[PDB]
PDB file of C-alpha atoms in Angstrom:
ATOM      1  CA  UNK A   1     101.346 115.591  76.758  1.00 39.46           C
ATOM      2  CA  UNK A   2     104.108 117.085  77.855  1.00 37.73           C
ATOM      3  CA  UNK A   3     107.348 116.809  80.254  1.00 37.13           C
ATOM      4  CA  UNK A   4     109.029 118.391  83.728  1.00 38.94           C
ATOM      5  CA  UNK A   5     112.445 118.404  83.728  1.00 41.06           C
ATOM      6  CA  UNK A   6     112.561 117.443  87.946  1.00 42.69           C
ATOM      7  CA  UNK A   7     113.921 114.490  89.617  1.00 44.10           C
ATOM      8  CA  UNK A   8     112.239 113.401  92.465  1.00 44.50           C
ATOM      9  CA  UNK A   9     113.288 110.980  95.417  1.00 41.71           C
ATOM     10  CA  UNK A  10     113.759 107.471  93.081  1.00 44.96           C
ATOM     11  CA  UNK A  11     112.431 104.511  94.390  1.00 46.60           C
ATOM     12  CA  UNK A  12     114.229 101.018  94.137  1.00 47.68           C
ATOM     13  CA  UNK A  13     113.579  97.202  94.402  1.00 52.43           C
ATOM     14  CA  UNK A  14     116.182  95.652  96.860  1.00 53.04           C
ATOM     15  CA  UNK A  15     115.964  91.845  98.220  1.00 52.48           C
ATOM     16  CA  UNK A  16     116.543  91.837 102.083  1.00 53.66           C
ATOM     17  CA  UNK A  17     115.997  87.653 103.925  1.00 53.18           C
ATOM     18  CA  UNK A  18     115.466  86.876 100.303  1.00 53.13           C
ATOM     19  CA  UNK A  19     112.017  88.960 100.449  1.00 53.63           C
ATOM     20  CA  UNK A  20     112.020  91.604  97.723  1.00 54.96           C
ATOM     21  CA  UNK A  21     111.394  95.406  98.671  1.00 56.64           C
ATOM     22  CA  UNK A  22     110.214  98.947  97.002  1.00 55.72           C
ATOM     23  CA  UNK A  23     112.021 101.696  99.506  1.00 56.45           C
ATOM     24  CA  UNK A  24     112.979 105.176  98.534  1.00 57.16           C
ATOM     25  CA  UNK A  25     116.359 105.401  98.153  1.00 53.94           C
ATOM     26  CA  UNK A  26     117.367 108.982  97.214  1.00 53.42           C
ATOM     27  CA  UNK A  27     121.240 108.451  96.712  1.00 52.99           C
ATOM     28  CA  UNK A  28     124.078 106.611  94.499  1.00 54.86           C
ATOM     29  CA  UNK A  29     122.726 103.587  92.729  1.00 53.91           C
ATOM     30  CA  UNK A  30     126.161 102.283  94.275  1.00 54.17           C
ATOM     31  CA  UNK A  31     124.813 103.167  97.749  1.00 53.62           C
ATOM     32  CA  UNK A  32     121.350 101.634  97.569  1.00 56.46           C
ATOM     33  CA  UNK A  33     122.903  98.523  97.037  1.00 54.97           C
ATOM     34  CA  UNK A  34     125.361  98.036 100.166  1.00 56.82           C
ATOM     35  CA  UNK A  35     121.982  99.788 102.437  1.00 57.49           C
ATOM     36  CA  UNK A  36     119.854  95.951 101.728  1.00 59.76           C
ATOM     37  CA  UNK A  37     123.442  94.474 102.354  1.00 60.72           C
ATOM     38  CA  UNK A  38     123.800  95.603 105.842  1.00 58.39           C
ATOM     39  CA  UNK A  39     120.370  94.678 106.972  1.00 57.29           C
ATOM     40  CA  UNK A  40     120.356  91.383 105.303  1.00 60.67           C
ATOM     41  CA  UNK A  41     124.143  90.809 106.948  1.00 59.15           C
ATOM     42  CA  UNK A  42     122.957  91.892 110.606  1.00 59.26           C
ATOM     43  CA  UNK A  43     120.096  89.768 110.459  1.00 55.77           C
ATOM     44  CA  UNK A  44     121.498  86.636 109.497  1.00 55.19           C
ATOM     45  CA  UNK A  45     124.406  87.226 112.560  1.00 55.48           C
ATOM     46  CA  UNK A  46     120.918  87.543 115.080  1.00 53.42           C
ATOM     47  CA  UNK A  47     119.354  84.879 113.328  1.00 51.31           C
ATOM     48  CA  UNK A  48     122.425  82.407 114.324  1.00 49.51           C
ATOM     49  CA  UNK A  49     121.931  83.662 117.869  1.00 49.85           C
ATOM     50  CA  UNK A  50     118.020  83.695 118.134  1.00 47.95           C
ATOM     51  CA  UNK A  51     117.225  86.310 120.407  1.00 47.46           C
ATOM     52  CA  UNK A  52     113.351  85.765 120.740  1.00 47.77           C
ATOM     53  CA  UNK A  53     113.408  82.965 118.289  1.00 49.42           C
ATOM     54  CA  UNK A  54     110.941  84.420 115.960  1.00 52.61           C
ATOM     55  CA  UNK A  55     110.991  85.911 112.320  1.00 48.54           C
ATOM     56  CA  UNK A  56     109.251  89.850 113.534  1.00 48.18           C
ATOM     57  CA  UNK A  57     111.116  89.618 116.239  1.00 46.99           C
ATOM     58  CA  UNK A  58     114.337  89.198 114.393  1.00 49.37           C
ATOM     59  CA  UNK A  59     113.756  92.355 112.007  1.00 50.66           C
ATOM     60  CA  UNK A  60     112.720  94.799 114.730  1.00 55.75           C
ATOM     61  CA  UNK A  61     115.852  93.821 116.286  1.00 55.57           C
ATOM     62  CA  UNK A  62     118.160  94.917 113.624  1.00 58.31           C
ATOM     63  CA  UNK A  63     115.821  97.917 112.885  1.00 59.55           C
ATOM     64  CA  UNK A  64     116.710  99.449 116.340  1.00 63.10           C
ATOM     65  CA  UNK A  65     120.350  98.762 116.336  1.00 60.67           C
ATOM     66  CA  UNK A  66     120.744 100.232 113.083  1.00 61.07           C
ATOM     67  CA  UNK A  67     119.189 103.506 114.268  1.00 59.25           C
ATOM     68  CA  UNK A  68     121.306 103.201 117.296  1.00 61.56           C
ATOM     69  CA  UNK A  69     124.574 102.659 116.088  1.00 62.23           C
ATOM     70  CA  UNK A  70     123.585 105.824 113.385  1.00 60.03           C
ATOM     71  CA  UNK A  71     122.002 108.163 115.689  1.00 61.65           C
ATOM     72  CA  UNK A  72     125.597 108.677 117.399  1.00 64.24           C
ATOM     73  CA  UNK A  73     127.435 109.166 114.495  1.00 66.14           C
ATOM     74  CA  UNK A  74     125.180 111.889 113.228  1.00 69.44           C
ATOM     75  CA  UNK A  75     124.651 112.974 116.909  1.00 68.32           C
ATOM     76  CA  UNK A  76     128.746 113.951 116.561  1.00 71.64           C
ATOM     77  CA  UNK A  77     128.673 115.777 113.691  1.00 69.67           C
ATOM     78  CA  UNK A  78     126.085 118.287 115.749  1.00 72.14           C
ATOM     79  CA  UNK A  79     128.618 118.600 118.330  1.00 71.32           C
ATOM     80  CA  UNK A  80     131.477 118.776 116.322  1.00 71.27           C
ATOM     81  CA  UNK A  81     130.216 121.979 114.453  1.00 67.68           C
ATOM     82  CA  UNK A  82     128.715 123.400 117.539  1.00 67.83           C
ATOM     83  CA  UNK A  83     131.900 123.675 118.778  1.00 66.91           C
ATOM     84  CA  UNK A  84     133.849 125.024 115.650  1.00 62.82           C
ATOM     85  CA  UNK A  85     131.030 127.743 116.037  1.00 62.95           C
ATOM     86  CA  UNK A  86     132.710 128.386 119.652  1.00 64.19           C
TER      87      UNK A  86
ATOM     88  CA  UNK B   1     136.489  90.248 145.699  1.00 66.25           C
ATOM     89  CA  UNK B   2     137.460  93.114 142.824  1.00 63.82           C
ATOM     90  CA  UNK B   3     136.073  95.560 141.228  1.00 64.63           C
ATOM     91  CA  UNK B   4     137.822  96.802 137.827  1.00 64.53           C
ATOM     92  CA  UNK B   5     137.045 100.848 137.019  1.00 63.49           C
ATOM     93  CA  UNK B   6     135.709 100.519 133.541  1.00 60.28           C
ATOM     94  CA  UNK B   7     132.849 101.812 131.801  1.00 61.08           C
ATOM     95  CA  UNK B   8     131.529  99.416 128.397  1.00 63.45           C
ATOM     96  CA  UNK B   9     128.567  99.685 126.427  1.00 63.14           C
ATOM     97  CA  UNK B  10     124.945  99.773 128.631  1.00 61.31           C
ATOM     98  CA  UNK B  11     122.155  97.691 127.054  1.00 59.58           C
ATOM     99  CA  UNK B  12     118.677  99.441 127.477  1.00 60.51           C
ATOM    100  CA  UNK B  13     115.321  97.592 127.509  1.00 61.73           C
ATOM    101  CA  UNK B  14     112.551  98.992 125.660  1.00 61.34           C
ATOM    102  CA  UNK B  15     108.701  98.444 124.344  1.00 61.87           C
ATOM    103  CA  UNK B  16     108.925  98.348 120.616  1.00 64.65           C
ATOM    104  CA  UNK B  17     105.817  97.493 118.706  1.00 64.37           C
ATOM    105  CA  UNK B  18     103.897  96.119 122.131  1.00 64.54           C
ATOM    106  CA  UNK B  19     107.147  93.427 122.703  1.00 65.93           C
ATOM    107  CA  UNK B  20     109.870  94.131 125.017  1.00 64.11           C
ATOM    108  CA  UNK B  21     113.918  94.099 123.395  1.00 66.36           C
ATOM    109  CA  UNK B  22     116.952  94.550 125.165  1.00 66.21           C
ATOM    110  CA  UNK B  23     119.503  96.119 122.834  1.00 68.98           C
ATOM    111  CA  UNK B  24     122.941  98.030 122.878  1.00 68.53           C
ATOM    112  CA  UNK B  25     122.219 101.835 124.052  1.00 66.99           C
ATOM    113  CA  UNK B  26     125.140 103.650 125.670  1.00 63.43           C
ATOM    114  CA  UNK B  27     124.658 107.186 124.032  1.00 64.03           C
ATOM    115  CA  UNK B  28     122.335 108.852 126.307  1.00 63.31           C
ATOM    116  CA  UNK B  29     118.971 107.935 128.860  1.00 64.91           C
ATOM    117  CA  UNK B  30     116.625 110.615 126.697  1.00 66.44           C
ATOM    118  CA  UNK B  31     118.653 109.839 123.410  1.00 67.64           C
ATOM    119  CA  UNK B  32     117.614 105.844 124.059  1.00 69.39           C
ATOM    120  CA  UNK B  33     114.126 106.554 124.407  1.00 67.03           C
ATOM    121  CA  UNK B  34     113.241 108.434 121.214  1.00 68.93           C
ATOM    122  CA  UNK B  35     115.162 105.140 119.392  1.00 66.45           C
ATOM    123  CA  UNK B  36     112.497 102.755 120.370  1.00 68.08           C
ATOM    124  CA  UNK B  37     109.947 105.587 119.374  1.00 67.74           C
ATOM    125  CA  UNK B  38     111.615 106.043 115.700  1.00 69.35           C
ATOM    126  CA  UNK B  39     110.755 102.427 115.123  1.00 68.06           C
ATOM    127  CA  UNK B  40     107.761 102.506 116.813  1.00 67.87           C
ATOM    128  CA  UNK B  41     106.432 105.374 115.237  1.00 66.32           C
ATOM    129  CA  UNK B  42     107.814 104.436 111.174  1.00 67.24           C
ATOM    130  CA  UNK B  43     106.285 100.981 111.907  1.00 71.01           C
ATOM    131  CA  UNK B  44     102.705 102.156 112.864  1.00 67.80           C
ATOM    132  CA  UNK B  45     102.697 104.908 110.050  1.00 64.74           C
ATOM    133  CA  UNK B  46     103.401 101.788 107.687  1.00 65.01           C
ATOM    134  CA  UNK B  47     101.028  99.382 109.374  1.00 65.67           C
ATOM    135  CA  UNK B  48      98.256 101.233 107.497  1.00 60.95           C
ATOM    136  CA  UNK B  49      99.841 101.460 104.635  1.00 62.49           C
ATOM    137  CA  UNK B  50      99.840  97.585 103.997  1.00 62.30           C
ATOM    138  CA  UNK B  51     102.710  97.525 101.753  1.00 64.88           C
ATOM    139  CA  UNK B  52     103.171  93.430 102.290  1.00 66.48           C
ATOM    140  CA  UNK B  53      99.885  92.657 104.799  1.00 68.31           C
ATOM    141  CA  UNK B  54     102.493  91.007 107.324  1.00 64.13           C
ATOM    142  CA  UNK B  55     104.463  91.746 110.387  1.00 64.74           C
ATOM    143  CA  UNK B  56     108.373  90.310 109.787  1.00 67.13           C
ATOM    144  CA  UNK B  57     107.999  91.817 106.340  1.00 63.20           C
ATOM    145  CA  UNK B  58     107.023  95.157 108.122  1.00 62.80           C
ATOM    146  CA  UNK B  59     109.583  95.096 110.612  1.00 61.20           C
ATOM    147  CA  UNK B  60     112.405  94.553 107.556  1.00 66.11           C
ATOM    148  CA  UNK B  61     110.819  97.318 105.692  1.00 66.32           C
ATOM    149  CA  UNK B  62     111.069 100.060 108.200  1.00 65.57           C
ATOM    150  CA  UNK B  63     114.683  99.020 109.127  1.00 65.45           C
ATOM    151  CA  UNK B  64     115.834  99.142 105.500  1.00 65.08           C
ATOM    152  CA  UNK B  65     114.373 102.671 105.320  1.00 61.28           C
ATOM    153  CA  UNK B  66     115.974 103.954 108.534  1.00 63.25           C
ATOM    154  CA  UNK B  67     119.133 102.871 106.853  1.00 60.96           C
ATOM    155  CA  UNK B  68     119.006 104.913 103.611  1.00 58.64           C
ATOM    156  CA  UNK B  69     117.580 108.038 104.937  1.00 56.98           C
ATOM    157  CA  UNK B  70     120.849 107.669 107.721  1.00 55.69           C
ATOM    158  CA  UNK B  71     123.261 106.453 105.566  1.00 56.85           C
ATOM    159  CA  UNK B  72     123.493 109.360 103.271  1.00 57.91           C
ATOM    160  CA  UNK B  73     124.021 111.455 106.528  1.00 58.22           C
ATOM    161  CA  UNK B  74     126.661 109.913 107.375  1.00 55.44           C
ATOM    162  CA  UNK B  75     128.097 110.554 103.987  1.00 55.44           C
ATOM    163  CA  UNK B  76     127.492 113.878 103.714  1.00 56.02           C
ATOM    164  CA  UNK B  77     129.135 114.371 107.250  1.00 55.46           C
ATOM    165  CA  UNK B  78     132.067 112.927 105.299  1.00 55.75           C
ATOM    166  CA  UNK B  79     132.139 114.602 102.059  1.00 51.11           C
ATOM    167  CA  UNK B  80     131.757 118.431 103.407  1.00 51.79           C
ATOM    168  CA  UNK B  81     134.725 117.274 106.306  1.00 54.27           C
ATOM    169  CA  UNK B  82     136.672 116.491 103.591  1.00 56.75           C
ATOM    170  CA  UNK B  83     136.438 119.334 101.248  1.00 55.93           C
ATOM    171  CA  UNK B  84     137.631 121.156 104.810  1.00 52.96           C
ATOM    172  CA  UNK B  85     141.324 119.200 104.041  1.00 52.84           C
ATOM    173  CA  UNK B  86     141.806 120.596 100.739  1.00 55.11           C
TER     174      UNK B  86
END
């Protein structure tokens, strides 16, 4: 048998509400680490507020913030070289 | 009686997954409605997947992998902004 030198998107085991994951990753093995960080971080601070009081409900909480809070930073840098084409 | 001219962060409600969730949405009206959807959406394409057979552990999943594939945006916005200083 024989070999392709490619490297695909990498794949990598985090632990997030001390459940362990498989997620693509695709970046810094540095990086990867922080990402399970932050979720794990912003669902413990909802946890201690108990929104719906409910373990789903807790995770699709944080899961629509984080896209929130992400889809305006990334919704500036469209805007910001928009207008340097200008 | 007062009222003081300010403008703070707007919560939106939303239907995520069948349940209702008030969260933190002051970017746009159009912008908020496609953030529900993103979860939505990455949820249902995983619920046939059956990566752990359970809700919570779904909702977790999705929100970890919004995260990664964003976070590296962000970064990027960074790194090519940067080499623009040299």
């Amino acid at each position: 048998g024989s070999h392709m030198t490619e490297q695909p998107k990498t794949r990598v085991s985090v632990r997030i509400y001390g459940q362990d994951y498989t997620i693509v990753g695709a970046e810094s093995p540095a990086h990867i680490r922080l990402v399970a960080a932050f979720v794990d971080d912003k669902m413990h601070e909802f946890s201690e507020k108990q929104p719906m009081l409910d373990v789903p409900k807790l995770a699709v909480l944080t899961a629509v913030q984080i896209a929130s809070e992400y889809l305006k930073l990334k919704e500036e840098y469209q805007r910001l070289r928009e207008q340097l084409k200008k």
